[PDB]
Design a binder for this molecule. Structure first.
Ligand SMILES: [Cl-]
Length: 407
């Protein structure tokens, strides 16, 4: 989904209303908000964290969207309310609450809170403790939390925040139950929760509960984990069709072969058909050939390495795609196309990140070395030499991971 026009709209609104341009960090944070992403603000104090959350709430309000700004102190509630009411347009409904407030002001908050007649609410972590039940019955497009420790003091707190962004209690329970088993929970794609932004991160994150954020909102408030898939990358220091035939003989089924050009692809297709292999091509009849591969009629599928490729990116079958073979490295080397194509062999099938095997046939030492360093930098993955690969053990890991996915 395209986001650049929404980002410039946010960027312009910020400059006009705040008076100054978004900072380096705020630009990064804006690009996330505009895409509906949740995140932890990783930056020091005085670089515009509160200002950013305040301006986000205001921008969302123009579209009729709802926000909750949560602070650890009463003075932060008071100051944010004051700044908001001076910055606000005629249309926007802003209400705040703290215990030292006048009975008059408290009653205006309580009325509109109950009637759902607000755009922006500003309250403390103390208000959250006293009103968990009423708050968990509400959906906000944006929840900004200044206090991180308050989020994690009580496990009940994490749940309240998750419910405030439109995640039903039943899904939190199902997610938690799966995580506890040692599995990865796959959130429902049609759910569209709101944005949760936490102001800082815990140096000491504690328990299984903060993992609900990873699986439900695609972010962590703890340490930032490696982006490595469960793939073993193996390099063959040649283009031997004989070596290829011997890998096909043990891999047998669920194989994708990516050639550099359509010309080389056809050559390879010709040779494999000659050796009576059950091979299909993707250049001429993609839809028919892919369906045949999917249902198990075709064992090997040959295609062309391309950045927004039908076979390189589009295809989503970890149960069926097990082995990816590159006939030469994607021209460049193009690590981005390499990561996408090899990624076909490894993704989540029933809470388990299944095993993939990516084999590169590359004779050019220079081209291979450039691919190896780029893959280490971008994907935190290494490529191992043919002699280091135990093919029988790899086939076993491919098969065993797909049984554990079935469980
Ligand atoms: Cl201001």
């Amino acid at each position: 989904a395209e986001f650049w026009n929404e980002y410039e709209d946010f960027r312009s609104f910020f400059k006009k209303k705040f008076g100054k341009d978004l900072t380096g960090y705020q630009r990064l944070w804006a690009k996330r908000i505009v895409q509906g992403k949740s995140f932890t603000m990783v930056a020091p104090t005085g670089v515009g964290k509160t200002t950013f959350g305040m301006m986000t709430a205001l921008w969302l309000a123009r579209k009729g969207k709802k926000s909750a700004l949560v602070f650890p102190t009463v003075t932060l509630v008071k100051q944010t309310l004051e700044r908001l009411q001076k910055l606000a347009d005629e249309k926007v409904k802003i209400f705040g609450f703290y215990s030292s407030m006048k009975k008059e002001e408290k009653e205006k908050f309580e009325k509109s809170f109950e009637e759902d007649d607000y755009h922006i609410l500003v309250f403390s972590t103390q208000f959250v403790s006293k009103n968990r039940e009423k708050l968990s019955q509400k959906r906000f497009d944006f929840v900004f939390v200044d206090d991180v420790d308050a989020v994690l003091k009580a496990s009940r707190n994490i749940d309240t925040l998750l419910m405030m962004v439109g995640i039903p209690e039943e899904i939190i329970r199902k997610a938690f139950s799966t995580i506890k088993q040692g599995k990865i929970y796959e959130r429902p794609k049609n759910l569209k929760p709101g944005i949760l932004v936490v102001s800082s991160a815990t140096a000491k994150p504690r328990g299984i509960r903060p993992l609900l954020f990873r699986d439900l909102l695609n972010f962590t408030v703890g340490r930032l984990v490696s982006v490595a898939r469960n793939i073993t990358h193996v390099r063959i220091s040649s283009r031997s069709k004989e070596k290829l035939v011997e890998l096909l003989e043990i891999f047998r089924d669920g194989i994708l072969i990516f050639a550099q050009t359509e010309e080389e692809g056809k050559e390879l297709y010709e040779y494999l058909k000659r050796f009576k292999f059950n091979v299909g091509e993707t250049w001429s009849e993609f839809e028919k050939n892919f369906e045949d591969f999917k249902v198990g009629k075709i064992n090997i599928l040959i295609g062309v390495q391309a950045y927004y490729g039908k076979l390189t990116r589009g295809v989503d079958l970890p149960e069926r795609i097990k082995y990816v073979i590159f006939w030469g490295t994607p021209s460049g080397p193009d690590v981005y196309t390499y990561i996408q194509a090899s990624g076909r062999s490894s993704r989540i099938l029933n809470g388990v990140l299944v095993k993939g095997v990516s084999v590169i046939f590359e004779e050019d030492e220079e081209i291979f070395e450039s691919l190896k360093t780029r893959l280490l930098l971008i994907a935190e993955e290494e490529i191992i030499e043919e002699a280091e690969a135990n093919w029988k053990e790899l086939v076993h890991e491919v098969e065993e991971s797909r049984r554990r996915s079935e469980r």
